[PDB]
Amino acid sequence: SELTEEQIAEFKDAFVQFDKEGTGKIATRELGTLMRTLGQNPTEAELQDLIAEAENNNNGQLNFTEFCGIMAKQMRETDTEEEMREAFKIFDRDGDGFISPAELRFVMINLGEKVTDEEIDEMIREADFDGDGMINYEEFVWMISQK
Ligand SMILES: [Ca+2]
Ligand SMILES: [Ca+2]
Ligand SMILES: [Ca+2]
């Protein structure tokens, strides 16, 4: 995910709003209702996809990480360069200023995106034009913009 401070507290607030059980979780059936409560607006099919999935993958309750996770993929609708730089620091395991195939999978797995060293390697080559096997704030911004 890559939500700012205000954004995080925004959906996080609307998240606790639908948690009377005190389980820090929100019913997947209330997901669509929560979206309406938020500036979001997922397509009918979309809601039916994530809800049905979480219905047999999370019993009947959803987690902050679950909701946020989606909100993240949804927020991607904005290719703002700002949110990219922030994601650059988070992704880049090191402070050198570059990302390597190793660091790529390491992060993708942290977020929740299951990927192999093969598929991710190609993704790097796509954003890597200088051909060096490393990513810079520029090559990163581009590949994540399409994410
Ligand atoms: Ca709950
Ligand atoms: Ca690094
Ligand atoms: Ca490069």
Side-chain angles (χ1 to χ4, degrees):
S1 64
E2 52 183 90
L3 310 322
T4 58
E5 301 179 271
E6 59 183 276
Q7 293 276 210
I8 287 175
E10 182 179 271
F11 63 78
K12 164 61 184 297
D13 185 78
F15 175 86
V16 296
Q17 285 181 30
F18 301 93
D19 184 57
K20 287 70 179 300
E21 307 293 271
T23 57
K25 280 214 283 299
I26 58 172
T28 177
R29 306 157 177 197
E30 283 304 284
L31 208 295
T33 307
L34 181 51
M35 287 297 180
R36 301 176 182 184
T37 281
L38 297 173
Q40 300 308 330
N41 188 87
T43 312
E44 196 67 271
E46 184 62 89
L47 284 174
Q48 303 293 330
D49 287 296
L50 56 106
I51 290 174
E53 181 61 89
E55 185 176 88
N56 66 270
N57 185 211
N58 306 96
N59 289 212
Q61 273 274 209
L62 206 98
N63 294 273
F64 174 81
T65 25
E66 305 289 90
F67 182 58
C68 189
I70 296 147
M71 299 286 293
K73 75 172 187 181
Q74 299 184 149
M75 286 225 200
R76 295 304 317 132
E77 56 177 87
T78 310
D79 57 272
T80 181
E81 290 65 81
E82 301 182 270
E83 203 65 274
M84 321 303 237
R85 207 177 184 177
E86 296 300 278
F88 180 75
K89 304 183 296 176
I90 302 172
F91 265 74
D92 194 345
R93 314 299 313 165
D94 317 290
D96 70 279
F98 297 95
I99 305 175
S100 289
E103 297 181 79
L104 186 58
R105 56 153 165 188
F106 217 93
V107 179
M108 297 260 67
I109 301 168
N110 291 332
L111 323 182
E113 303 298 88
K114 286 71 175 180
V115 285
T116 62
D117 297 271
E118 298 183 274
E119 62 180 290
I120 65 160
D121 181 273
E122 300 183 273
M123 182 178 67
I124 299 174
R125 173 57 178 181
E126 293 181 86
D128 167 64
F129 299 105
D130 52 67
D132 71 324
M134 314 190 68
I135 300 298
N136 41 88
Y137 164 68
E138 298 180 83
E139 305 173 313
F140 176 79
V141 165
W142 185 93
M143 62 166 162
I144 65 162
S145 175
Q146 318 303 267
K147 284 184 173 300

